[PDB]
Copies of this chain bind each other. A is one copy, B any other.
């Protein structure tokens, strides 16, 4: 009997044994189908489960990537190409990958990754997500899934043929596949931890809300993403207009009264033409096709679920990086924050950037933003004015929403663990002033430093082991801390509703603070909303 052949509920599949960069071996099944290819009449619609197959399906090749724009702003710059699809683009992209340790466990914990990329880009096949180190160093089953992105995943028109949230229904079906099958690979289907970063963390958090996902997993890890972020959802009314704008841009009928004509034309267009025409006039951290409240995956806004306690009762581990904003500013204000060493921002340039980065608020609100994000020890310092741009974008779009989500989870009696990730890799290829950007922790979570052919220092290898241990301790037990307190593994205290402690994740540190950034988060969540109310005569 061949242990690399596995009989799934739809047929048999064949995997392959491979090496970790770690020296240990793992078994691997790449490209398991979990839905019918969502092509032809099935475009924009919810996935159908996969049809049974006879024989043994060879699942040994990384699957196709879902159709998406390719980023060429910086050419072959490694900081950018690491996030571009590394497998062929196709609408036939609904696949799962499974990676098991050796020897195969019986009832191991299962860590299921959901990638980010602003709901219009990303793929489970990226080298930075390679599953082998995490599985073999921590003895967990590691799973990843594809889901449709961009208008192909999130077109909404309020009609049955464009119902919204297709990409979320994709993730739900993959979750169902895992519960029905992961025990055949040595995983315990009652010990599934979802983890994701960015739009993948939003996705995870939406599974903490949906009644369709409630019983499909055990706990959740959310890296730099929360469902209260202003980019995480779009109203149904605005989604309908963006879809019609897309129909216009590609030459289709676009009348609000005959939505049948628009969907049918859109189903005939080339998929690359669709994703390449989504980009109208949108501000920073505004993505055109994202989740909506549809009635079935969600039937109320996340903030209404949070206010009422209608969310899954379980532990969560979540956090932010210190420079969440720069990445998006680098791609949005391409004249101001050039990708070069030694960039600084003048006070006059800062005052203009504030208007460009918060284009919807009135003058009085802009003044408050300026006051809140000025270094009053040295108001004109050109480093301070550059950093202030990162902090106002990162606080509003990322950090403060993570805080809000963790706070409501803790108030309802759930164990919460909060981190602030502060480590900058020695080999970071971005300019020195960018600090610790959005996404930097992913390399350490997946154990890339344990690949000796990359350039990581010995200390960074140790740091990556610590982080994989915290993450997988959390997946296995609900608590990232080990049993015997260690000098290498500082105590990570709970994030309580009143205390709001967080652990700083970095090389030479075990600092525990509160928040992070409680005062700036109160500015966005409490002060600025009431000032906008008072001044909207």
Asked whether, in the complex, the Cβ of A519 is within 8 Å of the Cβ of B376, the reply is yes
Q: Which of A91-99, A237-245, A451-459, A524-532 contacts B (4 or more CB under 8 A)?
A: A524-532
Find A527's partner among B367, B518, B523, B537 (CB 8 Å cutoff): B367
Find A523's partner among B371, B377, B515, B531 (CB 8 Å cutoff): B371
**Chain A contact patch, size range:** 20 to 34
Does any Cβ of B come within 8 Å of A364's Cβ? yes
Complex interface bits, A138-182 against B, C-beta within 8 A gives 1, otherwise 0: 000000000000000000000000000000000000000000000
Asked whether, in the complex, the Cβ of A371 is within 8 Å of the Cβ of B527, the reply is yes
List the B side residues contacting A530 at CB < 8 Å.
367
Asked whether, in the complex, the Cβ of A518 is within 8 Å of the Cβ of B367, the reply is no
Does any Cβ of B come within 8 Å of A341's Cβ? no
Asked whether, in the complex, the Cβ of A364 is within 8 Å of the Cβ of B522, the reply is no
A contacts with B: majority SS: helix
Asked whether, in the complex, the Cβ of A522 is within 8 Å of the Cβ of B367, the reply is no
Asked whether, in the complex, the Cβ of B537 is within 8 Å of the Cβ of A363, the reply is no
Asked whether, in the complex, the Cβ of A526 is within 8 Å of the Cβ of B371, the reply is yes
Does any Cβ of B come within 8 Å of A374's Cβ? yes
Tell me the nearest residue of chain B to A527, going by C-beta: B371
Tell me the nearest residue of chain B to A378, going by C-beta: B498
Tell me the nearest residue of chain B to A530, going by C-beta: B367
Does any Cβ of B come within 8 Å of A514's Cβ? yes
Does any Cβ of B come within 8 Å of A282's Cβ? no
Asked whether, in the complex, the Cβ of B534 is within 8 Å of the Cβ of A376, the reply is no
Interface centre among A377, A500, A519, A531 (most CB of B within 10 A): A377
List the B side residues contacting A371 at CB < 8 Å.
522-523, 526-527
List the B side residues contacting A535 at CB < 8 Å.
364, 534-535
Find A522's partner among B374, B515, B527 (CB 8 Å cutoff): B374
Asked whether, in the complex, the Cβ of B367 is within 8 Å of the Cβ of A534, the reply is yes
In whole angstroms, what is the CA distance A530 to B367 when docked? 8
Q: Which residues 376-427 in A have Cβ within 8 Å of B in the complex? A: 376-378
Asked whether, in the complex, the Cβ of A534 is within 8 Å of the Cβ of B363, the reply is yes
List the B side residues contacting A498 at CB < 8 Å.
378
Q: Which residues 495-511 in A have Cβ within 8 Å of B in the complex? A: 498, 500
In whole angstroms, what is the CA distance A534 to B363 when docked? 8
Can you add 19 more A-B contacts, CB < 8 Å, to A363-B534, A367-B527, A371-B522? A364-B531, A364-B534, A364-B535, A367-B531, A367-B534, A368-B527, A368-B531, A371-B523, A371-B526, A371-B527, A374-B522, A376-B521, A376-B522, A377-B500, A377-B514, A377-B515, A377-B519, A535-B535, A537-B537
Task: Please list the residues of chain A having a beta carbon within 8 angstroms of any beta carbon in chain B.
Answer: 363-364, 367-368, 371, 374, 376-378, 498, 500, 514-515, 518-519, 521-523, 526-527, 530-531, 534-535, 537
A-B contact pairs, 8 of them (CB 8 A): A363-B534, A364-B531, A364-B534, A364-B535, A368-B527, A374-B522, A377-B514, A377-B519
